[PDB]
Amino acid sequence: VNDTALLTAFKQTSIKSDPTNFLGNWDPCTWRGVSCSSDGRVIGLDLRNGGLTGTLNLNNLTALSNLRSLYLQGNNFSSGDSSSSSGCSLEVLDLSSNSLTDSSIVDYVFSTCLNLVSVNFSHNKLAGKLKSSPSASNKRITTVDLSNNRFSDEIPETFIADFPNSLKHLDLSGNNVTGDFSRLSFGLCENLTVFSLSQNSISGDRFPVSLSNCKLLETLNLSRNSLIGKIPGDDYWGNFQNLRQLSLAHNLYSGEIPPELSLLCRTLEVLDLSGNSLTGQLPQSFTSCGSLQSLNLGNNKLSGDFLSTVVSKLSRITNLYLPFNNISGSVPISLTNCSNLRVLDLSSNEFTGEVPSGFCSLQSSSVLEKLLIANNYLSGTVPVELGKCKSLKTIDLSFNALTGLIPKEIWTLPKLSDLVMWANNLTGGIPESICVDGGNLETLILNNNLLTGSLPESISKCTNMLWISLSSNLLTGEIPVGIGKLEKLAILQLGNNSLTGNIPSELGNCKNLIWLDLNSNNLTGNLPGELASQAGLVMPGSVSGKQFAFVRNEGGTDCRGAGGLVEFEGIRAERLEHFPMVHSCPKTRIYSGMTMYMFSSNGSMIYLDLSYNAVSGSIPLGYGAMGYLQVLNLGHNLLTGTIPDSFGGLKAIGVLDLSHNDLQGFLPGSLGGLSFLSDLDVSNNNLTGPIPFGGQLTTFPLTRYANNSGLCGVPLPPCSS
Amino acid sequence: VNDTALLTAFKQTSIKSDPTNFLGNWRYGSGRDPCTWRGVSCSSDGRVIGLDLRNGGLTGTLNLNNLTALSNLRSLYLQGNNFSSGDSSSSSGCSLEVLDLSSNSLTDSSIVDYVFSTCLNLVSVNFSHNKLAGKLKSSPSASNKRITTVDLSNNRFSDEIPETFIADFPNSLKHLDLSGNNVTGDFSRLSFGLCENLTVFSLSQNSISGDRFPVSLSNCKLLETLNLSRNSLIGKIPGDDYWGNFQNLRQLSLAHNLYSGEIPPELSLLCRTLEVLDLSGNSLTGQLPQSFTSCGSLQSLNLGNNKLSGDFLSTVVSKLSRITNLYLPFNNISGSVPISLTNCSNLRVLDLSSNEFTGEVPSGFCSLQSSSVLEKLLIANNYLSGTVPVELGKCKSLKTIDLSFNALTGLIPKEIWTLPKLSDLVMWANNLTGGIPESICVDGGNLETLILNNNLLTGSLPESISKCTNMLWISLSSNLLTGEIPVGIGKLEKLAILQLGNNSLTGNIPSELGNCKNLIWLDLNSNNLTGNLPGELASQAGLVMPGSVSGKQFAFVRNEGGTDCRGAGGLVEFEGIRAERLEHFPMVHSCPKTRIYSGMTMYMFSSNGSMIYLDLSYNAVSGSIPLGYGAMGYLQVLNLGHNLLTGTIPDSFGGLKAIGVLDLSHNDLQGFLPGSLGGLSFLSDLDVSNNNLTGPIPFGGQLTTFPLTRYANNSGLCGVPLPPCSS
Ligand SMILES: *[C@@H]1O[C@H](CO)[C@@H](O[C@@H]2O[C@H](CO)[C@@H](O[C@@H]3O[C@H](CO[C@H]4O[C@H](CO[C@H]5O[C@H](CO)[C@@H](O)[C@H](O)[C@@H]5O[C@H]5O[C@H](CO)[C@@H](O)[C@H](O)[C@@H]5O)[C@@H](O)[C@H](O[C@H]5O[C@H](CO)[C@@H](O)[C@H](O)[C@@H]5O[C@H]5O[C@H](CO)[C@@H](O)[C@H](O)[C@@H]5O)[C@@H]4O)[C@@H](O)[C@H](O[C@H]4O[C@H](CO)[C@@H](O)[C@H](O)[C@@H]4O[C@H]4O[C@H](CO)[C@@H](O)[C@H](O)[C@@H]4O[C@H]4O[C@H](CO)[C@@H](O)[C@H](O)[C@@H]4O)[C@@H]3O)[C@H](O)[C@H]2NC(C)=O)[C@H](O)[C@H]1NC(C)=O
Ligand SMILES: *[C@@H]1O[C@H](CO)[C@@H](O[C@@H]2O[C@H](CO)[C@@H](O[C@@H]3O[C@H](CO[C@H]4O[C@H](CO[C@H]5O[C@H](CO)[C@@H](O)[C@H](O)[C@@H]5O[C@H]5O[C@H](CO)[C@@H](O)[C@H](O)[C@@H]5O)[C@@H](O)[C@H](O[C@H]5O[C@H](CO)[C@@H](O)[C@H](O)[C@@H]5O[C@H]5O[C@H](CO)[C@@H](O)[C@H](O)[C@@H]5O)[C@@H]4O)[C@@H](O)[C@H](O[C@H]4O[C@H](CO)[C@@H](O)[C@H](O)[C@@H]4O[C@H]4O[C@H](CO)[C@@H](O)[C@H](O)[C@@H]4O[C@H]4O[C@H](CO)[C@@H](O)[C@H](O)[C@@H]4O)[C@@H]3O)[C@H](O)[C@H]2NC(C)=O)[C@H](O)[C@H]1NC(C)=O
Ligand SMILES: CC(C)[C@H](C)[C@@H](O)[C@H](O)[C@@H](C)[C@H]1CC[C@H]2[C@@H]3COC(=O)[C@H]4C[C@H](O)[C@H](O)C[C@]4(C)[C@H]3CC[C@]12C
Ligand SMILES: CC(C)[C@H](C)[C@@H](O)[C@H](O)[C@@H](C)[C@H]1CC[C@H]2[C@@H]3COC(=O)[C@H]4C[C@H](O)[C@H](O)C[C@]4(C)[C@H]3CC[C@]12C
Ligand SMILES: *[C@@H]1O[C@H](CO)[C@@H](O[C@@H]2O[C@H](CO)[C@@H](O)[C@H](O)[C@H]2NC(C)=O)[C@H](O)[C@H]1NC(C)=O
Ligand SMILES: *[C@@H]1O[C@H](CO)[C@@H](O[C@@H]2O[C@H](CO)[C@@H](O)[C@H](O)[C@H]2NC(C)=O)[C@H](O)[C@H]1NC(C)=O
Ligand SMILES: *[C@@H]1O[C@H](CO)[C@@H](O[C@@H]2O[C@H](CO)[C@@H](O)[C@H](O)[C@H]2NC(C)=O)[C@H](O)[C@H]1NC(C)=O
Ligand SMILES: *[C@@H]1O[C@H](CO)[C@@H](O[C@@H]2O[C@H](CO)[C@@H](O)[C@H](O)[C@H]2NC(C)=O)[C@H](O)[C@H]1NC(C)=O
Ligand SMILES: *[C@@H]1O[C@H](CO)[C@@H](O[C@@H]2O[C@H](CO)[C@@H](O)[C@H](O)[C@H]2NC(C)=O)[C@H](O)[C@H]1NC(C)=O
Ligand SMILES: *[C@@H]1O[C@H](CO)[C@@H](O[C@@H]2O[C@H](CO)[C@@H](O)[C@H](O)[C@H]2NC(C)=O)[C@H](O)[C@H]1NC(C)=O
Ligand SMILES: *[C@@H]1O[C@H](CO)[C@@H](O[C@@H]2O[C@H](CO)[C@@H](O)[C@H](O)[C@H]2NC(C)=O)[C@H](O)[C@H]1NC(C)=O
Ligand SMILES: *[C@@H]1O[C@H](CO)[C@@H](O)[C@H](O)[C@H]1NC(C)=O
Ligand SMILES: *[C@@H]1O[C@H](CO)[C@@H](O)[C@H](O)[C@H]1NC(C)=O
Ligand SMILES: *[C@@H]1O[C@H](CO)[C@@H](O)[C@H](O)[C@H]1NC(C)=O
Ligand SMILES: *[C@@H]1O[C@H](CO)[C@@H](O)[C@H](O)[C@H]1NC(C)=O
Ligand SMILES: *[C@@H]1O[C@H](CO)[C@@H](O)[C@H](O)[C@H]1NC(C)=O
């Protein structure tokens, strides 16, 4: 079994697709990826990020006697058959991003592969229970990563302790193991510096006593589990005098934050206690955390002036998150003594007074990049001093009591990318100098204000724009044709204003536009067929991964618009349930989550509301080819012609509203082939003929077809009579 | 020398006055046995075992040696008299067991060294409330097996406490009171000894220092009250398991020291027993720790005048079952008033003044499933907004509402004016509107205090004010009142302070004001009054008795801009308010130059007083100045400036000996300045400008000292500081 004849046996037997042609040209040492040695033997195979699709069995590669490095990460390998039985010389194995399901691969590497130093099985589909530790005859293994798999059920009491004493890095995150944490043995845990059980289902009100034996621990991550009770205090955290990162976030801890946790402050760099039910405040003992950089205490019930009596004295703070707490009063001015502050999040608290801006007038230029104080009760005007924070990229003042104009100094911040200040009483307009003298923005979210004027053609200069929201303002003028230069724009909301003119044809050049809401304006002209000219070509983009809330208007056509999408970073849902904009419709529901595309390529527009305008002409035939379109509201216009038969192509549609127009002709039969059409309304037109018998049409209420010119068939009186 | 004869030499040598004839029974005649004598008590065999002459108005010089010579004297109660100190003697074989010499004028502390060295059977000795001066040095003799209670409080002891002073007391000591002196010392250096029976200890009101507690103090396992208030203790409050040493402690006070930092959670080790806590008047920060949820016996919690903040009112205080008196004023608590505070179903007194509260006034304490026991609601000097909740009418036990210095608006609902027990209605410095109903103190409570100045009240002062016979202080200044001053005010014979300045009142100054027996402060400036100065305002001169307005927190902002500034100053009720909030109140800067005085209302006379402050300026009063005005011997401010007065300045005004401010400017006064004004030694602010005065300016007293502007615009005044009359 020659080495050159093994790799060829691997290529033919295991790999079933190589569109990169990066496994072609397959002497041993000249083959792509395989790094050889001087004496002609193969020692490593590096095929990372190759887009390879096949079935893997490690015995077919460990048969290579001198193979010590195997990199197969970033591919699409599946689990193979047991096959053959050979020794293993591997010192470094990486199988990070694949589709491996048979966890017997981990049993092999842990039983053989005795010289193994590091192995990464992460991000796969390895299933089953955790059983075997690395062999005791292995004296070298230092780092083992089994994170992000599908391992199930309990963890063996001595699973961690059974590891070789050389272990340094053990990561078990991203599974669904279970068990009382207190009954899990770490053993001697000598040399262990990094350990994570994050994102599992571990329970218990105690830590295992053996955990205290890990004197050299630098990272302890226990987040997103079900640990309960009080955070251990007294003397416990003195056991870990090297700990740089501790996370206990998103468990069920209660009580106050133990002052005794400050025995890590000699070395503690990162802390995450967020997502619990902690009260009181950060104890004064933490003034000694001269090394702390990231302090995350969000989503708890903390209160008091500990922001000034403690946090301001942390000379090296750079990332301070206390959103979703019970902190009242002014934002203390002393917080500016945090010279190195880059990200400050104080959203969803009870802060009053003025927007903090002192950070910008230090004796040194401020490095503050993100300022987030949404869902508070800040009053006054957007202070002009923020213009001196030249490193600002994200300003989130939404859902406050702000008033007055938006100073010119904000639109001139050189690196600004996100301007988020919806849900205030801000007045003024949009300068004609946006994004040209100021930063090229990604989000401009100022809906639910009192802004006046028109949207400048200068918006064409914001080529990076992903999301524009200016709904429910007092805007006027025409929609600028320059919007067409924004080929990364994904969401555009301008509803409930007084816009006039045509819907520009140039909107068709917005390559990534998936969400267009222009309801409740004064728009005229024809429907531009160019709106669908990107159907089947839309690519996703950087608008994914943003917090959003959707307010569904469940009142049919009487209620203006199909609903309301809002950027929802840092805002409690309750603050929205009491926003009178919600009660504008007698029936509402709050969908909530993170923006997520449902396609990888070749998509279409997702949400289209042009209702309540004065648009005339005929529905462009092309509109029906939008396969991912889930909402199409053209109600309350002056549309004429027939409903195109192409609408049988709206596979994804769930809400279709064409009511209150002057449409003629027949309902397309293909409407019955829409398996998700759950909200139809064609009432108040000149429609005639039978109601399609397919799909869900025969069940919609009589209200949805009424005030037409000869519709018949269930739910109406039958056509044959 | 026979017990009957010993008592005889006491009445002669010592007693110097017996105004009640308490000691009249002390005569040798019918049954000369001393047991018929008043205050004397004998044993069956006929010898004296006790002498009780308490609160008997006895005045004289005391030497105990003449009384301790009684072989069988075991009790001697002389408290509450006016005994001074005589010259001590070496000793006289003492056998006392109980000694009470409280409330006298004793000065020589050698009486204490005597009683502590002899009298080896003393169980209790009370020297409190005297003038005993000097250092502490001597503890009770080591031969005294019995002494339990020693009260040395409210004296004039000085300088260092001996490190072993407390430890050298017999081991039977249970009560030791050292408060009310000015003794110094590091508290960590003080030895309590084995502290085996001590249960009540106090060093409060002294000048004691240190940043630690003495280790010895933890030996007092049976302590029940510990009071170290009003001293100079610094540092953090002791924590760790220290308070575990006091498993019976009921009352702890560390108030008014220099403590800083947080409240130690391990202070909660008292919470099985703690009934009364007072940490007020320090620089404590943070919150009341969560460990205090277990203080189910805590009745009084006082954390006022600190830097506390947070939501501990809700997360801790609301879960305390038996809290009756809750004081958190002068802190940094922001947010809204926690509604969960209503779960405290025994709360009688709530004070949340001088914090940063926002929102509405609590409307929940009253509308509960049982009779609300709430008696005092104090939320002055916050940022509360809205209207006074009608719900307060359900708090049928309310006696005091203080909502002053907020941003409240609207009308006072009649449900406030009908609280049957209401006594103090204090809501000044707001934007309230409407008027005083016509049915005050009839359907509602007979008020002591109606303080609504600096508001937007309209209408007249109803005559039904005559029904508030308990009234002590009315303040409606700087409102929009109209109408006349009701003559019914003359029925308020307890009224001491009436402030109505800066309204649009018309009519006369009712002569019925002269029947207000206790009126000492009358302020009607900047109104539209007319008629003549009623001479009855002085009818109480020399007869005014002090009253219950005494003891209330006040602030007087003195306007130092001359007569051009309206009125002679602002007296305002100031409970629960920070002086800083007054320095930024626009009334305070209406006059350019100002200075804020503050304190507690105090009378300078015990009887036979006069009015103290009379401001009637900026009206249209005409006529002559009543001569009787000059006989107000305690009058200190008299401002009749800016009126239409005519005639001469009474020569009677030489009797205004207490006067310091006298403004008669801008009138039509005529004649000479009485030379008797020269005898007004305290006159420091005089203005008679803009009158018709003429002739020489008097030479004695201060009348030659005032600026030129204070005699100007008259018709021929001469004499220094003006040009001489002879030229
Ligand atoms: C332990 O362990 C753990 C694990 O286990 C970890 O954690 C982790 O972390 C990380 C960090 O990094 C992260 O990641 C990130 O994230 C973000 C987001 O975040 C957020 O969210 C998330 C999500 O969530 C979700 O899920 C969850 C679960 O998982 C849940 O719970 C929730 O609810 C949600 O869910 C939702 O959604 C979903 C999806 O859709 C669905 O399914 C569902 O149904 C729903 O709907 C989360 O996770 C997070 O969390 C966090 O946070 C919080 C707050 O804070 C807290 O509480 C928690 O705890 C956590 O924590 C963390 O963090 C924090 C902060 O935040 C701190 O403090 C602490 O410590 C920690 O760390 C949140 O919430 C995102 O954003 C990102 O992304 C990024 O990156 C990436 C890469 O990596 C990429 O790809 C992308 O793109 C991005 O990027 C960006 O950035 C970068 C730099 O960095 C760059 O490069 C780029 O470009 C970008 O940029 C930006 O900016 C710019 C300007 O400059 C512009 O231009 C652009 O455009 C943009 O904008 C990331 O991914 C993750 O997530 C986590 N995980 C967990 C599981 O947790 C930790 O870390 C440990 N610890 C220690 C201490 O060590
Ligand atoms: C410890 O020890 C100590 C000793 O040292 C003690 O203390 C004490 O206490 C007591 C109580 O108990 C007291 O007494 C009382 O008082 C009151 C007042 O009070 C207030 O004031 C005061 C005074 O002040 C002053 O002084 C000081 C020092 O000395 C200073 O610091 C200040 O500043 C001031 O000074 C000022 O003034 C003066 C005078 O003028 C001058 O000289 C100067 O210069 C200046 O100007 C004080 O002291 C107090 O304090 C308190 O409080 C606070 C707050 O809260 C705090 O912080 C503090 O600490 C304290 O505390 C205490 O108290 C509290 C309560 O409040 C509590 O909580 C705590 O715990 C403690 O205790 C204040 O501020 C008055 O009022 C009173 O009187 C009353 O009583 C008597 C007898 O009892 C009588 O005679 C009178 O008349 C009255 O009576 C009333 O009541 C009763 C019952 O009780 C009745 O029966 C009657 O009838 C009456 O009633 C009323 O009401 C009603 C209705 O309800 C009506 O009808 C009627 O009309 C009326 O109104 C008393 O006197 C004292 O003072 C103290 N002392 C000291 C030194 O501090 C303690 O206690 C201890 N502790 C334990 C625990 O044990
Ligand atoms: C890509 C983002 C911009 C976007 C918010 C996205 O993440 C999100 O998942 C979108 C597509 C969702 C959020 C709320 C959804 C709507 C919620 O409202 C509704 O009432 C339902 C009713 C019914 O199920 C319809 O079929 C779909 C319909 C009408 C949904 C259509 C799809 C959404 C509009
Ligand atoms: C008994 C209460 C009604 C009263 C507030 C009382 O306690 C209080 O002591 C009064 C009498 C004091 C408080 C402030 C005092 C004034 C302090 O401020 C002043 O302007 C001085 C100036 C000058 O020294 C005058 O001679 C006295 C005068 C003008 C004082 C007159 C007396 C007071 C008005
Ligand atoms: C690893 O090598 C073994 C041995 O050649 C492979 O097993 C053979 O697979 C072929 C093709 O399916 C069968 O016809 C033979 O019967 C199998 N066994 C032999 C030859 O002994 C195995 O498939 C290889 N691994 C992978 C994943 O393909
Ligand atoms: C468009 O936005 C305006 C914002 O003003 C909405 O007008 C509000 O209507 C509600 C009705 O309940 C009133 O309570 C508010 O006072 C109105 N706002 C103001 C500022 O006066 C209007 O309803 C919105 N229209 C739609 C269809 O959403
Ligand atoms: C899916 O999208 C791709 C990429 O846009 C389309 O295919 C290519 O499109 C580009 C222009 O962007 C042309 O230059 C290529 O010649 C196209 N290649 C093809 C068609 O193989 C593709 O047409 C889309 N598929 C649909 C709509 O079904
Ligand atoms: C209490 O006793 C003192 C003495 O200790 C009395 O003070 C004397 O008063 C008279 C006038 O009545 C003066 O002549 C004396 O000079 C005062 N003596 C001193 C030392 O000042 C005081 O009057 C008595 N108080 C009463 C009886 O109320
Ligand atoms: C001091 O006041 C007392 C009583 O407050 C006066 O003495 C008596 O006062 C009553 C009125 O309350 C008169 O009817 C009596 O005639 C007075 N008795 C006398 C004078 O013996 C006392 O006159 C006052 N002293 C003054 C004003 O100097
Ligand atoms: C009487 O009280 C009124 C209360 O409104 C005073 O009027 C205000 O006085 C302040 C003083 O600083 C000024 O700043 C305000 O502008 C005044 N308001 C108005 C509407 O005029 C008034 O000054 C008081 N009068 C006197 C003589 O003191
Ligand atoms: C002094 O007072 C007299 C009045 O008492 C002033 O002189 C006259 O006053 C009467 C009113 O009584 C007026 O009718 C006259 O017109 C006054 N005469 C003049 C010439 O004005 C006098 O002016 C007063 N002087 C000062 C400085 O106040
Ligand atoms: C792509 O290759 C880089 C460089 O070796 C590696 O760090 C990364 O993990 C690969 N990406 C994957 C496996 O998704
Ligand atoms: C604008 O101010 C009014 C004042 O009543 C307030 O109710 C409203 O909520 C403010 N607007 C927004 C969007 O919060
Ligand atoms: C269609 O309907 C409209 C209004 O319903 C009516 O006025 C019009 O005449 C109709 N047109 C036809 C049938 O062509
Ligand atoms: C009055 O006598 C009582 C009864 O002994 C005593 O308690 C009280 O202190 C006396 N009053 C004084 C000393 O002021
Ligand atoms: C003082 O305590 C000691 C020790 O407990 C005891 O012997 C003595 O009797 C106590 N004295 C009194 C008066 O209770």
Swiss-Prot record, chain A:
Catalysed reactions, as listed in the record: L-seryl-[protein] + ATP = O-phospho-L-seryl-[protein] + ADP + H(+); L-threonyl-[protein] + ATP = O-phospho-L-threonyl-[protein] + ADP + H(+); L-tyrosyl-[protein] + ATP = O-phospho-L-tyrosyl-[protein] + ADP + H(+)
EC id: 2.7.10.1, 2.7.11.1
Extracellular face residues: 1-721
Residues of the full protein shown: 31 to 757 of 1164
GO cellular component: plasma membrane
Residues with glycosylation annotation: 2, 60, 76, 120, 176, 191, 221, 326, 337, 425, 496, 522, 602, 686, 707
Comment field on protein domains: Contains two pairs of conservatively spaced Cys (Cys pair 1 and 2) possibly involved in forming some heterodimers.
Keywords assigned: ATP-binding, Cell membrane, Glycoprotein, Kinase, Leucine-rich repeat, Lipid-binding, Membrane, Nucleotide-binding, Phosphoprotein, Receptor, Repeat, Serine/threonine-protein kinase, Signal, Steroid-binding, Transferase, Transmembrane, Transmembrane helix, Tyrosine-protein kinase
PTM (free text): Autophosphorylated on Tyr and Thr residues.
GO MF annotations, alphabetized: ATP binding; protein serine kinase activity; protein serine/threonine kinase activity; steroid binding; transmembrane receptor protein tyrosine kinase activity
Function description: Receptor with a dual specificity kinase activity acting on both serine/threonine- and tyrosine-containing substrates. Binds brassinolide. Regulates, in response to brassinosteroid binding, a signaling cascade involved in plant development. May be involved in cell growth and vascular differentiation.
Subcellular location field: Cell membrane
Membrane topology, as annotated: Single-pass type I membrane protein
Tissue: Predominantly expressed in vascular tissues. Expressed only during postembryonic development with a very discrete pattern of expression, preferentially in the two protophloem cell files at the elongation zone of the root. The expression in these two cell files attenuates as the phloem cells differentiate in the upper root. In cotyledons and leaves, it is expressed in phloem cells, starting at the cotyledons and shoot apex, moving toward the basal part of the leaves, where the expression is weak. Expressed in the secondary and tertiary veins and in the upper part of the cotyledons and leaves.
Family from the record: Belongs to the protein kinase superfamily. Ser/Thr protein kinase family.
Placement of LRR repeats on the sequence: 41-62, 66-87, 89-110, 115-137, 140-161, 166-188, 191-212, 216-238, 242-264, 267-289, 291-311, 316-339, 340-361, 367-388, 391-412, 415-437, 440-462, 464-487, 488-510, 512-534, 604-626, 628-650, 652-675, 676-698
Ranges spanned by the short sequence motif Cys pair 2, renumbered to the chain: 712-719
Locus of motif Cys pair 1: 29-36
Protein name as catalogued: Receptor-like protein kinase BRI1-like 3
Principal location listed in the UniProt entry: membrane
